[PDB]
Design an enzyme around this catalytic site. Structure first.
Site, short mmCIF file in Angstrom:
data_model
loop_
_atom_site.label_atom_id
_atom_site.label_comp_id
_atom_site.label_asym_id
_atom_site.label_seq_id
_atom_site.Cartn_x
_atom_site.Cartn_y
_atom_site.Cartn_z
CG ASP A 148 -1.75 -1.26 1.31
OD1 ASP A 148 -2.18 -1.76 0.24
OD2 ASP A 148 -1.97 -1.77 2.43
CE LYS A 206 2.29 -2.83 -4.37
NZ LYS A 206 1.99 -2.13 -3.08
N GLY A 208 -4.57 -4.47 -3.59
CA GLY A 208 -5.59 -3.45 -3.74
C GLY A 208 -4.88 -2.19 -4.19
CG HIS A 209 -2.42 -2.25 -6.89
ND1 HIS A 209 -2.00 -2.48 -5.59
CD2 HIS A 209 -1.70 -3.09 -7.67
CE1 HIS A 209 -1.06 -3.41 -5.59
NE2 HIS A 209 -0.86 -3.79 -6.84
CD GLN A 211 0.59 -8.91 -2.22
OE1 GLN A 211 1.18 -9.62 -3.03
NE2 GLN A 211 -0.63 -8.44 -2.44
N1 LIG Z 1 -2.54 11.84 -0.12
C1 LIG Z 1 -2.04 10.96 -1.00
N2 LIG Z 1 -2.69 9.83 -1.23
C2 LIG Z 1 -2.06 9.07 -2.15
C3 LIG Z 1 -0.88 9.32 -2.83
N3 LIG Z 1 -0.59 8.29 -3.70
C4 LIG Z 1 -1.56 7.43 -3.52
N4 LIG Z 1 -2.46 7.83 -2.57
C5 LIG Z 1 -3.58 7.07 -2.04
O1 LIG Z 1 -3.04 6.24 -1.04
C6 LIG Z 1 -3.69 4.95 -1.06
C7 LIG Z 1 -2.66 3.86 -1.22
O2 LIG Z 1 -3.26 2.58 -1.05
P1 LIG Z 1 -3.11 1.45 -2.16
O3 LIG Z 1 -3.77 1.90 -3.41
O4 LIG Z 1 -3.53 0.17 -1.54
O5 LIG Z 1 -1.53 1.37 -2.55
P2 LIG Z 1 -0.88 0.18 -3.45
O6 LIG Z 1 -1.43 -1.10 -2.86
O7 LIG Z 1 0.62 0.34 -3.28
O8 LIG Z 1 -1.34 0.44 -4.88
C8 LIG Z 1 -4.75 5.02 -2.16
O9 LIG Z 1 -6.03 5.24 -1.59
C9 LIG Z 1 -4.27 6.16 -3.05
O10 LIG Z 1 -5.34 6.81 -3.71
C10 LIG Z 1 -0.18 10.52 -2.54
O11 LIG Z 1 0.89 10.91 -3.01
N5 LIG Z 1 -0.85 11.30 -1.60
O1 LIG Z 2 -3.73 -12.64 1.88
P1 LIG Z 2 -2.26 -12.92 2.14
O2 LIG Z 2 -1.98 -14.39 2.40
O3 LIG Z 2 -1.37 -12.33 1.06
O4 LIG Z 2 -1.92 -12.14 3.52
C1 LIG Z 2 -0.61 -12.21 4.13
C2 LIG Z 2 -0.23 -10.85 4.65
O5 LIG Z 2 -0.08 -9.92 3.55
C3 LIG Z 2 -0.76 -8.72 3.85
N1 LIG Z 2 -1.26 -8.17 2.59
C4 LIG Z 2 -1.62 -8.89 1.48
N2 LIG Z 2 -1.69 -8.18 0.38
C5 LIG Z 2 -1.35 -6.90 0.80
C6 LIG Z 2 -1.23 -5.68 0.10
O6 LIG Z 2 -1.24 -5.74 -1.13
P2 LIG Z 2 -1.01 -4.45 -2.10
O7 LIG Z 2 -2.36 -3.73 -2.16
O8 LIG Z 2 -0.57 -5.05 -3.43
O9 LIG Z 2 0.08 -3.59 -1.48
N3 LIG Z 2 -0.89 -4.59 0.82
C7 LIG Z 2 -0.68 -4.72 2.14
N4 LIG Z 2 -0.75 -5.81 2.90
C8 LIG Z 2 -1.10 -6.88 2.16
C9 LIG Z 2 -1.87 -9.08 4.82
C10 LIG Z 2 -1.24 -10.23 5.62
O10 LIG Z 2 -0.60 -9.79 6.81
O1 LIG Z 3 -4.75 -2.79 -0.55
C1 LIG Z 3 -4.34 -3.92 -0.02
N1 LIG Z 3 -4.29 -4.06 1.28
O2 LIG Z 3 -4.13 -3.01 2.04
C2 LIG Z 3 -4.66 -5.18 1.82
C3 LIG Z 3 -5.93 -5.23 2.65
O3 LIG Z 3 -6.87 -4.46 2.33
O4 LIG Z 3 -6.00 -6.02 3.61
MG LIG Z 4 -3.14 -1.74 -1.68
#
Ligand SMILES: Nc1nc2c(ncn2[C@@H]2O[C@H](COP(=O)(O)OP(=O)(O)O)[C@@H](O)[C@H]2O)c(=O)[nH]1
Ligand SMILES: O=P(O)(O)OC[C@H]1O[C@@H](n2cnc3c(OP(=O)(O)O)ncnc32)C[C@@H]1O
Ligand SMILES: O=CN(O)CC(=O)O
Ligand SMILES: [Mg+2]
Ligand SMILES: Nc1nc2c(ncn2[C@@H]2O[C@H](COP(=O)(O)OP(=O)(O)O)[C@@H](O)[C@H]2O)c(=O)[nH]1
Ligand SMILES: O=P(O)(O)OC[C@H]1O[C@@H](n2cnc3c(OP(=O)(O)O)ncnc32)C[C@@H]1O
Ligand SMILES: O=CN(O)CC(=O)O
Ligand SMILES: [Mg+2]
EC number: 6.3.4.4
Lengths: 431, 431
Positions: free
Chosen positions: A13, A16, A40-41, A224
């Protein structure tokens, strides 16, 4: 270079999805190489939000061919669910998405197993996203798992599916005392989407090899984060795939020597969702502040994310494991208003030693204490700033310090969730 | 370059052990990154033979520090057995071997499971080496497996071991109707060697990172072969790890961008031990000839190896998957005396198409026929030749053709099992 990898340097998170969607404007291909729909992107274009899970983050660009590589565990259900959601919004997924026949299949019984295993762990639960990721990788390495390729023979598939489910159900009921998963139901659900799914199959290894020879721009999107790596992360509190750069080759078929630049997405502070060691974790007002200001809730499970200061010790491990070429500092805007900011620069081990290196397995992180360097924060707003010139000096200093501590330059700075709320100082594709 | 990878381009037993032992004369480190003791690497120095399994092939050189990386599944039993065998022969293993704390542990119940699973497959058995490799990788990705790091707390280890064995035994007896594995016995056997094993622990990721920064020569030694790769091989008739170049990074912690040269060990003909597709497999006199002349019997199980002509289609897949820099053609001497030699240059698919690309999963290789190019053999002896000048023209032509077909140069040619019965045309370390 032509082949750019975008991956999470922390615990996921980091942002990416945004950066991939941002940088693929010049890409021919976008490739997911590990994980499944546990990811979750979040992408935001002109205020419109899109949350992808299994579908690569280049799907919103028509000039891009999104690809789900062999390293990915693929849930036919999740794929169709996302496909329909995106198609109803004008995104012709089927026309721009290709996938590997070597991809392992995630089916209902994998989820049941996931849930059972997490239950058996009780208070020591990993905190998985309960999407069946772990069990799918298990059947794969065991060599009993089903793959996209198996779908090409509807007959033999049903047979293979039948015996593997007899295998798992025996455990679910006899060992776990849980409901069994209906063979017929799984067979029908899967058969209802077989033709669609298989029409997107391509020889990814070969495709990427031809693309490399043509000098096409290819972006690999990780899921992840580094410390969740099955081998190098805080085991057992990790995901079941290699989230580190090495997973690019194993999960796509592209030869490892063909990685030109590795871009580490680095969040200005830390978050972790799921159980596990988190040295700089904050339980005070500041932690709560980060969570609130950063809207920190799993884009997949919606679970509140644990927050903490940026950890340079942990990030340095990510530098060497991924042979990082540069960082993309994200959510710098979330720190606006803090009187001061801190970054961990060392660890105080339980035996009293001061180290700048990280412990491996989770157990070994016990009693480890963070040693902070405290810097002045800033009251000025940095949200949406698209020029380093528009940033306060305290922020520039914070940025420079991070670089000095890690020995890696910050080539991109994100100041908001939107694609444009960013400043690219050096593009990975021509750097 | 400084970091050279030596891996099998076919189905294993290409001669990795010899070439690694040969080339490490200039190396500071030798690193195994995947597999376990299922591997069988034969070294011959001045006629003296040594068969390694878990222990890296640089162990016979005192200037070299052998390293068992995290990607390796490690059997404490196998390690001690080999350690003692080597130590009694004047090789002070403990003094030149280091290993990762992130390594998964292979214990007796893994073997029991391996045997059970193979039994359940009946006639469709994978033909594993029954060393417990598969199950160990399964517990790992599942995140319930034990690792070298767990050994640092004798107490908590026994507890963890107890619950995981209760888990597996339930299946062994209730599901498979097989004997259970004694908890206490496994606990004692392991505890009897804990201190020795743990005294060789080192942070491999960090060590290799420091070595890279110093420009030290590092050789990564692969096990098995490309078509046995869990992702890209003839699934399910493969091993459970990534045998392809991408496994180097995931299994050692070295950043993928730090791979300088990938040397593919290529046997002048083909062999396969274990079930699975083998297009150019020979069941005639020639096949028998290869087996006999090449002394083809698993260096680990002693099982007779299946033989066949060199398959350029399959080898080309290995070229792209491993981003090969060059080949090391081995056992050229075994072809001496053949009237003619053949090399597959294309596949005739079941539907009639002619292709130069390989099928993925085993099922898809069904009905596939090899299309051969036939070249004149040679009666002259090439055994022990250390100069290309001493080779017959027919052999040089065979060599050149292989290069032309694959687009990759043959930098080394082996003409005998001995370290010196070789000709290095271009050393990977300075190339
Ligand atoms: N305030 C802020 N939010 C951001 C920025 N880049 C991304 N986000 C938000 O931060 C969150 C990151 O969560 P996630 O999408 O799960 O990250 P990922 O899993 O690495 O793709 C999302 O809700 C994005 O919309 C940034 O530079 N600033
Ligand atoms: O479900 P699992 O077996 O993979 O869970 C094992 C551990 O991995 C954590 N988990 C899994 N996917 C992601 C994730 O994916 P993102 O959005 O691409 O960044 N972002 C953040 N935490 C994550 C949750 C569990 O501790
Ligand atoms: O966006 C991915 N994660 O943060 C994992 C979750 O929702 O548990
Ligand atoms: Mg995510
Ligand atoms: N005749 C001949 N035998 C060789 C040559 N190189 C290696 N060998 C032998 O071929 C066998 C290869 O089997 P193995 O050691 O399992 O190969 P590995 O698993 O790739 O290390 C060994 O018995 C070697 O001693 C060569 O160039 N010529
Ligand atoms: O035991 P297993 O689960 O890995 O068996 C799965 C399949 O893998 C085959 N096998 C395993 N290791 C090796 C090998 O290692 P080497 O000496 O390093 O080249 N060389 C050749 N064949 C091998 C046997 C099975 O078909
Ligand atoms: O040397 C390794 N193999 O040939 C495997 C085996 O003996 O089965
Ligand atoms: Mg062998």
């Amino acid at each position: 270079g032509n082949n750019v990898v975008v991956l999470g340097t922390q615990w996921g998170d980091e942002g990416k999805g945004k950066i991939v969607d941002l940088l693929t404007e010049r890409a021919k291909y976008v490739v997911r190489y590990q994980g499944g729909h546990n990811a979750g992107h979040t992408l935001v274009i002109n205020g419109e939000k899109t949350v992808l899970h299994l579908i690569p983050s280049g799907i919103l660009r028509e000039n891009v061919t999104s690809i789900i590589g062999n390293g990915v565990v693929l849930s036919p259900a999740a794929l169709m669910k996302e496909m329909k959601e995106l198609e109803d919004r004008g995104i012709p997924v089927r026309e721009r998405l290709l996938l590997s026949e070597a991809c392992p299949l995630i089916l209902d019984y994998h989820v049941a197993l996931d849930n059972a295993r997490e239950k058996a762990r009780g208070a020591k639960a990993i905190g998985t996203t309960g999407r069946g990721i772990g069990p799918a990788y298990e059947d794969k390495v065991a060599r009993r798992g089903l793959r996209v390729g198996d779908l090409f023979d509807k007959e033999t598939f049903a047979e293979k599916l039948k015996e593997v489910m007899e295998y798992h159900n025996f455990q679910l009921v006899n060992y776990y005392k849980a409901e069994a998963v209906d063979y017929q139901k799984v067979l029908d659900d899967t058969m209802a989407v077989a033709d669609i799914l298989t029409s997107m199959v391509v020889d990814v290894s070969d495709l990427l090899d031809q693309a490399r020879q043509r000098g096409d721009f290819v972006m690999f999107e990780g899921a992840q984060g580094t410390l969740l790596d099955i081998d190098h992360g805080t085991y057992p509190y990790v995901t079941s795939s290699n989230t580190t750069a090495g997973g690019v080759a194993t999960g796509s078929g592209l030869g490892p020597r063909y990685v030109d630049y590795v871009l580490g997405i680095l969040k200005a502070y830390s978050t972790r969702v799921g159980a596990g060691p988190f040295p700089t974790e904050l339980f005070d007002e500041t932690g709560e502040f980060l969570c609130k200001q950063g809207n920190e809730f799993g884009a997949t499970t919606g679970r509140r994310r644990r927050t903490g200061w940026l950890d340079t010790v942990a990030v340095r491990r990510a530098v060497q494991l991924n042979s990082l070429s540069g960082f993309c500092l994200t959510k710098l805007d979330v720190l606006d208003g803090l009187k001061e900011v801190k970054l961990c620069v060392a660890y105080r081990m339980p035996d009293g030693r001061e180290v700048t290196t990280t412990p491996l397995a989770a157990d070994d992180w016990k009693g480890v204490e963070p040693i902070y360097e405290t810097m002045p924060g800033w009251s000025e707003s940095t949200f949406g700033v698209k020029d380093r010139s528009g940033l306060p000096q305290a922020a520039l200093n914070y940025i420079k310090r991070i670089e000095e501590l890690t020995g890696v330059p910050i080539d991109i700075i994100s100041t908001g969730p939107d694609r444009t709320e960013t400043m690219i100082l050096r593009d990975p594709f021509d750097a």
